[PDB]
Design a protein around this ligand. Structure first.
Ligand code: CDL
Ligand code: CDL
Ligand code: PC1
Ligand code: PC1
Ligand code: UQ8
Ligand code: PEE
Ligand code: PEE
Ligand code: HEC
Ligand code: HEM
Ligand code: HEM
Lengths: 59, 327, 32, 426, 295, 84
């Protein structure tokens, strides 16, 4: 879809005629912690303690 | 034994039947371009004879279930016909001959983009089946028409023939595989091939070939010898082109728009000796500039380059800063 | 184009129809 | 043997262990796993079958009584016999589904040859093994199967001599024949595992989930990521088959093809010829035999089916010549004005409707051929079922003719469109 | 694919157009406890069936493959079965494989370990004593039309009369369920023939039902082992259904998790050339291509 | 609740059942090698599953790892029961 076939006569890996987007368009990261997606059962501190116990005693 | 002078050769292959072997100048194997053969065969099949009549009657079905079917499937995945017709899936996946040709000649991008276009869709398809490409990708997919894709296909096929397929000479061969299976072990290649038995020598003249008249006819107007210098001929050509445009939604024009016949007539007149002032100067200038740009080969400008890395050993692998007078 | 290869193709296409013809004749004979 | 250049992969134990612990599998679906289901089932046949080896005494006059007494006194013997019997059917189903899947994908190209032939050979051997197994049942079905096999074998020699005696002693199931056939059955069953291992090693060269080439480079690790999925898919297919069998096969049934297995050789000398029927997997071959009463033509039909199934890559796929091969034609030569034709290229799968139509016609014809028994008591006397005849003819044509699987018009029309579009847009 | 019922072949299975095959299975539903859902053999039914088979049948038929001790855990106990079977005798000529184990030179009372042999020494003696037709061996008799229903139908279906054009030879009887509807067995079941130990009324339908149940109990795939295997199939199917979600988690959701990738293609315009693409790459099967292809 | 997930998820903006971006998106890494230039105009990603496919539990990751191990253990236990 891009265009004509280009052979190895083009030395550069990225030909000049291609388009490079500016820095404005590129989306920026959201460098903040977001709320955890956790269900009711696993949000129970007792269940968390059970998970830790299983991890550090049998796993 | 000599295959020539065998009993069959002595009896049947004789001057009386015009079956004699004629020795001429040595010539390369694969002397006929496959693309040219297909073009001439297509013209003979579709635009001549009862076969032409039948294939013209069935044209709506072929367009519906072959062209539009493929185009719809490709658009669903954000791909164009170029993604399948230019390089077959098999060639992109595993074929070694195409791999060698691409490595020796092609630029990495030509195949990199082809693979990444499918990677886009398939990364999601494998995760969740039934993926439909959104409109923003579909639009850029639909931007490219079939004219440029066929230009690329013809260029690639002609290049492959002229460079590599024109530099081959097949030989009698056994099973290439090293399998101990007797079925595969005793496979015999070289017989039951028409090329093997038609000509025993590289000097023998080629008996069968499309006549120059057939080639010239195939190079004529694809829509059936319309007179572009007459009003009735122009009207017939226009109706034929309009029905073709309707049949092929994304071949030469977007489905919404319509074909511009004045520019095409200007192109044809400029290509041929015929010329006059009946064409607007702006139209002539635009046509000439577009014709120049279409065949122009893109070239690198050598600008907007990134710094070349010159790595140096880390500090902990280098001598410490302090140094005094030894002795 | 070779005579024997062309003949091989013709017999490949035709032999199934020849066997169908033989089967039909056998059915007619078995009918009585 | 300088003509032999070596082997693809050395089957040393360490090399096999490393290859399988490092092998990666691209993301796939259930349809592209039948091959594994074909192997795992074999891995059970070697086990279950072995448990039957310690039970069966090759004496024809004791096999039925021994089986019946071991069903009661011994435990799990009848369970393993049932497992073996149903494993044969499941193996046939999986192998034929795998064959159809690989035919649909146009896996006849040169890079597929090692994968294809190495597979088909195994399939061929599998058939032979199955045949031997039947003879071990010592039922009237085994008697008929052995008689037919001996007749076909003798047809090669034109009925002169006794070249069949070394294995088919007297063309009857006796102690010698049963012993030899049972031991050969065991040996070839265990050889099938090695053949399947070789095929599996070879096929990985160009293994793909679908015809369309996804540009994915990352892959799963076979040992657990792909193995777990394969085992789960096997479980799912077993569940589906059990559900189907529950409705289709109620235990008390008015009639069944298994009733012909009532007779035990030696105990009953009277064979009910009116109701003769094999197991469904060998049903199509006997149906072909009854459809074509001629012995030589029927034998040639069976041999042609198997061998043409073996040589698909050579006949249909691309080779040394990059689609420049000259295919012979019958009628289109006049239309194109050319004695031969260049092999067409755009033989895609997913977007090609002609390929799908032809392949599904072929598959439906095979299913119809396997559907029922022609019942040759008056099948030929009456005008025979035209469906079986047409399906057999189409099976023969599809396997051997490139115009059904690589039609010319697909690329001719595309080139017509290309020329028209380029002319319009220059 | 679509079959015809008026032909006389069930589901398209030819070869049984000269007898009734769909009486109690397809066109009728005769209830049998064993084949019912979560069904099991009725111990009383099999007990009565063995009692009938040991007083009317057996004197003509037998099961060479089977032996009495099959009935130890369901129908009879060891001492009771021994008492019942001690009333019969086996000569050393009966044994299919006399072997060195059987060291008798005369008749002796049977034991539960003895195979079920008829009073005759061989098939030919039975044919001679039964008008030249051999009473079929009930072992493996499951492979008859209607399955367990077969024994029940023939035992009962004697009331109908032959149509015109069919001649019943002397010593033969008309039974529509038998091959060609002519059977050499005279009607055996008559009301009051057998006095049961449990006091059950003795009528020909009840006796036929008990005999059919007993005859089916001795089969291998069907019979005393089928119900437990059916329960086992149910259990395994339940296990597969319950394991499907964990397979989904371990395979498909996992693949979807692995496919959550981010890709970024940048413009690298350093002077370095792409030599590795131009001069690189390997093929495992190169030895199969070298000297053979593309030259 | 147990079934609340289905009810809450029903209110989603997804293209024909697939969660995809509504416009082209391009992501760059500031820690890339210097010889890399700007992002190519090619839209490599159609979907943003890298961010969407997240349970924001960077803390407490080991608990999720143990959960995954437990699910694998259940699957393997069923298979091993059949093998037994
Ligand atoms: C007029 C009479 C007509 C009779 C007709 C009927 C009988 C016909 C067959 C007769 C016997 C020949 C069989 C040939 C092979 C099978 C057929 C075929 O086309 O091959 C398919 C298949 C094609 O392979 P491929 O696709 O090319 O893949 C790569 C190759 O396999 C490359 O392989 P590789 O180089 O990696 O070597 C592999 C080799 C590694 O080698 C070694 O490490 C040692 C090799 C030397 C062993 C020395 C000891 C000899 C005694 C023990 C033999 C054990 C192995 C089995 C040998 C085969 C025969 C039993 O083996 C293994 O890795 C392990 C093997 C697996 C173990 C279990 C095997 C059981 C076989 C039982 C069936 C036998 C075939 C019956 C076929 C019937 C028709 C369908 O070939 C094999 O599977 C080869 C198997 C190994 C053969 C070893 C050498 C055999 C030499 C035979 C000499 C002539 C003997 C004549 C008398 C026979 C009396 C019985
Ligand atoms: C009511 C419904 C009943 C249904 C019954 C079921 C059967 C009927 C057909 C069912 C549907 C089709 C199933 C099979 C095909 C599936 C699709 C497919 O593969 O197509 C792609 C395939 C593409 O082929 P290709 O890629 O061009 O071939 C490459 C080469 O040409 C290489 O190919 P080639 O050039 O070599 O020729 C290929 C093909 C022919 O195909 C072609 O025509 C090739 C070109 C196809 C492209 C399009 C061409 C368009 C122009 C053709 C015009 C032909 C004239 C007809 C004009 C009609 C309009 C006026 O020829 C053959 O393979 C068979 C020839 C056998 C010769 C037998 C001679 C034996 C002589 C010796 C006998 C010895 C024994 C007896 C001795 C007795 C002594 C007394 O085309 C076909 O298969 C053609 C058929 C298209 C679909 C069927 C159309 C209907 C035809 C039958 C109508 C019957 C009506 C009955 C009415 C009854 C009322 C009561
Ligand atoms: C399978 C049984 C094998 C039996 C082997 C017994 C040996 C027989 C030969 C004895 C000596 C007589 C030799 C005569 C001269 C032969 C010369 C010749 O042709 O050279 C060959 C050449 C010779 O080897 P070479 O070319 O390396 O020789 C180099 C020169 N010398 C020997 C001097 C160093 O090699 C071949 O082509 C070998 C062909 C072997 C074919 C084996 C086919 C077996 C098929 C079995 C059945 C398959 C069933 C498949 C499954 C079916 C399922 C339905
Ligand atoms: C509104 C209603 C909604 C509900 C609709 C429900 C529809 C459900 C549909 C489910 C799928 C149905 C399956 C369709 C196909 C049935 C096929 C069939 O009849 O199979 C019967 C058999 C069933 O066994 P069977 O023994 O019961 O056979 C049928 C029995 N009679 C005849 C009585 C009807 O199918 C199988 O088990 C086969 C499965 C694997 C087949 C693999 C292909 C083999 C092909 C070999 C070809 C060999 C060619 C070479 C020969 C040599 C010469 C050329
Ligand atoms: C390349 O592509 C391919 C694939 O991908 C699609 C495939 O899937 C495939 C298919 C793959 C296959 C069929 C392979 C899968 C095989 C299967 C499922 C069956 C075999 C599986 C096995 C695990 C075999 C194990 C064999 C054994 C002998 C070990 C037995 C197992 C266990 C757990 C016991 C281990 C322990 C012991 C032996 C020791 C026990 C005793 C002691 C400790 C006591 C010792 C002390 C004293 C005193 C005795 C192929 C071939 C392929 O090519
Ligand atoms: C154990 C052995 C048992 C007996 C085996 C007997 C085998 C008998 C084989 C008979 C073959 C009959 C056909 C031969 C035709 C040969 C014709 C020929 O060479 O003439 C050339 C002519 C070409 O000329 P034209 O193109 O027409 O001229 C162009 C002019 N501008 O050739 C052809 O067309 C032939 C093409 C097909 C050839 C097929 C050959 C098949 C060979 C198979 C293998 C045979 C092996 C036999 C020994 C086996 C031992 C185990
Ligand atoms: C429906 C058929 C199957 C489908 C086929 C579709 C594709 C067709 C492609 C074209 C195939 C062309 C094949 C042409 C020949 C076919 C011959 C054939 O099949 O046999 C038929 C034909 C006649 O058969 P009938 O049963 O009489 O039929 C009734 C006639 N009124 O058979 C023959 O005549 C064949 C004779 C061949 C004899 C060859 C010589 C054999 C001599 C003995 C050899 C012993 C070798 C021993 C080797 C020992 C080594 C240690
Ligand atoms: C001797 C008087 C017999 C008694 C007592 C019983 N049967 Fe019999 N049976 C006898 C003969 C000679 C035959 C063969 C008839 C023929 O035409 O071949 C039979 C056959 C049967 C059959 C059918 C066998 C078959 O292969 O289809 C059945 C189902 C059968 N007999 C059942 C049966 C029962 C239940 C009996 C006790 C009530 C019984 N038979 C007693 C001779 C004699
Ligand atoms: C006993 C019979 C067979 C067994 C045990 C078997 C086994 C396998 C296995 C395990 C695989 C890899 C998993 C997968 O299928 O995706 C495979 C792939 C494959 N098999 Fe088989 N198979 C058998 C028959 C066949 C047949 C009949 C053919 C062809 C007619 C064949 C050709 C192939 C091909 C082409 C592939 C994939 C290679 C590719 O995609 O290029 N096999 N087989
Ligand atoms: C792929 C491998 C195998 C296949 C395809 C196969 C196939 C068969 C078939 C079709 C039958 C008869 C079917 C029936 O009864 O309806 C059978 C039975 C039998 N098989 Fe196998 N088999 C295989 C492996 C084995 C092995 C390895 C052994 C022994 C080591 C074995 C031993 C037996 C025995 C003894 C019988 C008969 C049992 C009896 O009659 O009681 N099988 N097999």
């Amino acid at each position: 879809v891009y265009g004509k076939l280009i052979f190895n006569n083009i030395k550069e890996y990225t030909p000049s005629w291609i388009k490079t987007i500016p820095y404005s368009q590129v989306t920026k990261p959201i460098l903040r912690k977001q709320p955890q997606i956790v269900g009711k059962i696993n949000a129970d501190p007792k269940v968390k303690k059970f998970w830790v116990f299983l991890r550090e005693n049998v796993q | 034994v000599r295959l020539e002078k065998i009993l069959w050769e002595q009896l049947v292959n004789v001057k009386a039947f015009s079956r004699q072997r004629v020795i001429g100048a040595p010539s390369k194997w694969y002397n006929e371009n496959r693309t040219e053969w297909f073009k001439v065969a297509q013209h003979n099949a579709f635009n001549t004879g009862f076969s032409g009549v039948i294939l013209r009657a069935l044209e709506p079905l072929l367009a519906k279930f072959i062209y539009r079917w493929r185009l719809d499937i490709a658009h669903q995945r954000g791909l164009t016909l170029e993604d399948s017709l230019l390089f077959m899936d098999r060639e992109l996946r595993r074929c070694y001959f195409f791999e060698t040709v691409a490595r020796q000649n092609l630029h990495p991008y030509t195949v990199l983009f082809m693979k990444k276009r499918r990677a886009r869709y398939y990364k999601v398809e494998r995760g969740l089946r039934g993926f439909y490409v959104p409109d923003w990708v579909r639009k850029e997919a639909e931007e490219r028409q079939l004219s440029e894709t066929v230009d690329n296909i013809f260029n690639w096929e002609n290049f492959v023939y002229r460079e590599y397929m024109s530099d081959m000479t097949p030989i009698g061969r056994w099973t290439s595989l090293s399998k101990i299976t007797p079925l595969d072990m005793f496979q015999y290649y070289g017989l039951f091939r028409n090329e093997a038995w038609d000509r025993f020598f590289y000097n023998e003249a080629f008996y069968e070939s499309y006549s120059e008249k057939e080639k010239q006819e195939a190079n004529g107007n694809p829509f059936g010898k319309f007179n572009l210098q007459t009003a009735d001929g122009r009207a017939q050509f226009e109706k034929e082109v309009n029905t073709f445009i309707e049949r092929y939604p994304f071949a030469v024009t977007k489905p919404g728009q319509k074909f511009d016949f004045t520019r095409f007539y200007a192109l044809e007149d400029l290509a041929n000796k015929r010329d006059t002032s009946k064409y607007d100067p702006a139209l002539l200038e635009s046509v000439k500039n577009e014709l120049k740009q279409s065949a122009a080969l893109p070239a690198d400008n050598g600008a907007n380059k990134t710094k070349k890395s010159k790595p140096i050993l880390p500090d902990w692998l280098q001598p410490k800063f302090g140094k005094a007078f030894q002795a | 184009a070779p005579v024997f290869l062309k003949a091989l193709r013709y017999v490949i296409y035709s032999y199934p129809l020849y066997v169908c013809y033989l089967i039909k004749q056998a059915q007619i004979n078995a009918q009585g | 043997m300088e003509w032999n250049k070596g082997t693809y992969m050395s089957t040393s134990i360490k090399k096999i262990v490393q290859y399988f612990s490092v092998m990666t599998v691209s993301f796939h679906d259930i349809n592209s796993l039948f091959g594994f289901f074909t192997f795992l089932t074999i891995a059970s046949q070697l086990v279950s079958g072995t448990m039957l080896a310690f039970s069966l005494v090759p004496e024809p006059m004791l096999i039925p009584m021994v089986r019946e007494e071991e069903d009661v006194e011994d435990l799990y013997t009848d369970d393993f016999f049932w497992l073996h019997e149903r494993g044969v059917d499941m193996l046939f189903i999986f192998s034929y589904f795998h064959l159809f899947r690989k035919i649909y994908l146009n896996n006849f190209e040169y890079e597929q040859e090692a994968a294809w032939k190495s597979g088909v050979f195994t399939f061929l051997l599998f058939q032979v093994v199955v045949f031997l197994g039947l003879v071990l049942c010592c039922t009237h079905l085994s008697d008929i199967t052995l008689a037919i096999a001996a007749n076909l074998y003798d047809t090669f020699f034109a009925g002169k001599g006794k070249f069949y005696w070394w294995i088919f002693t007297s063309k009857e199931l006796n102690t010698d024949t049963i012993i030899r056939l049972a031991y050969l059955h065991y040996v070839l069953a265990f050889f099938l595992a090695y053949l399947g291992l070789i095929h599996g090693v070879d096929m990985h060269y160009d293994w793909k989930n679908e015809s369309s080439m996804d540009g994915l480079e990352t892959e799963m690790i076979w040992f657990d990521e792909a193995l777990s999925n394969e085992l789960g898919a096997m479980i799912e297919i077993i569940l589906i088959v059990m559900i189907v069998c529950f409705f289709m096969y109620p235990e008390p049934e008015a009639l069944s093809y298994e009733f012909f297995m009532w007779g035990d050789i030696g105990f009953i000398n009277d064979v009910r010829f009116l109701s003769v029927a094999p197991h469904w997997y060998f049903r199509p071959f006997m149906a072909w035999l009854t459809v074509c009463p001629f012995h030589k033509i029927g034998l040639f039909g069976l041999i042609y089916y198997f061998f043409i199934l073996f040589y698909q890559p050579v006949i249909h796929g691309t080779n040394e010549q990059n689609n420049y091969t000259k295919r012979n034609v019958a009628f289109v030569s006049f239309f194109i004005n050319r004695s031969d034709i260049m092999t067409p290229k755009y033989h895609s799968v997913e977007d090609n409707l002609l390929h799908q139509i032809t392949f599904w016609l072929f598959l439906c014809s095979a299913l119809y051929v396997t559907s029922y028994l022609p019942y040759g008591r008056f099948y030929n006397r009456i005008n025979g079922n035209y469906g079986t005849l047409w399906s057999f003819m189409y099976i023969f044509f599809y396997l051997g003719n490139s115009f059904l699987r690589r039609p010319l018009i697909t690329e001719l029309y595309l080139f017509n469109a290309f020329v028209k579009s380029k002319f319009l847009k220059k | 694919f679509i079959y015809r019922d008026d032909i006389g072949a069930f589901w398209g299975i030819k070869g049984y157009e000269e007898l009734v095959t769909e009486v109690g299975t397809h066109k009728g539903h005769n209830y049998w406890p064993q084949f019912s859902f979560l069904g099991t053999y009725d111990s009383g039914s099999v007990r009565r069936g063995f009692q009938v088979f040991a007083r009317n049948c057996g004197n003509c038929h037998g099961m060479i493959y089977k032996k009495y001790d099959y009935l130890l855990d369901k129908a009879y106990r060891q001492l009771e079965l021994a008492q019942m079977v001690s009333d019969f005798t086996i000569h050393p000529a009966h044994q299919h494989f006399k072997q060195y184990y059987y060291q008798e030179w005369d008749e002796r009372d049977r034991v539960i370990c003895d195979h079920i042999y008829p009073p005759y020494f061989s098939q030919d003696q039975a044919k001679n004593a039964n008008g030249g037709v051999w009473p079929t061996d009930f072992s493996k008799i499951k492979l008859r039309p209607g399955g367990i229903n077969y024994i029940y139908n023939i035992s009962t279906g004697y009331h109908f009369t032959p149509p015109f054009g069919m001649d019943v030879p002397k010593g033969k009887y008309f039974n529509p369920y038998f091959d060609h509807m002519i059977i050499g067995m005279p009607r055996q079941l008559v009301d009051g023939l057998v006095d049961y130990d449990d006091g059950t009324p003795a009528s020909t339908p009840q006796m036929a039902y008990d005999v059919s149940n007993f005859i089916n109990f001795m089969q291998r795939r069907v019979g005393y082992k089928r119900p437990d295997k059916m329960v086992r199939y149910y259990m395994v199917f339940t296990g597969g259904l319950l394991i499907l979600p964990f397979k989904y988690f371990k395979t498909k959701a996992y693949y979807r998790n692995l496919l959550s990738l981010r890709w970024e293609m940048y413009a690298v315009r350093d002077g370095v050339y792409y030599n590795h693409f131009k001069y690189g790459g390997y093929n495992s099967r190169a030895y199969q291509f070298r000297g053979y292809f593309w030259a | 609740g147990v079934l609340s997930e289905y009810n809450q998820r029903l209110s989603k903006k997804l293209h024909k059942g697939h969660l995809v971006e509504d416009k082209p998106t391009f992501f760059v890494t500031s820690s890339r090698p210097g010889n890399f230039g700007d992002h190519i105009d090619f839209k490599v990603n159609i979907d943003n599953w890298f961010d969407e496919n997240r349970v924001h539990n960077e803390h407490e990751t080991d608990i999720r790892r143990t959960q995954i191990y437990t699910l694998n253990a259940i699957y393997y236990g069923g298979l091993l029961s059949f093998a037994r």
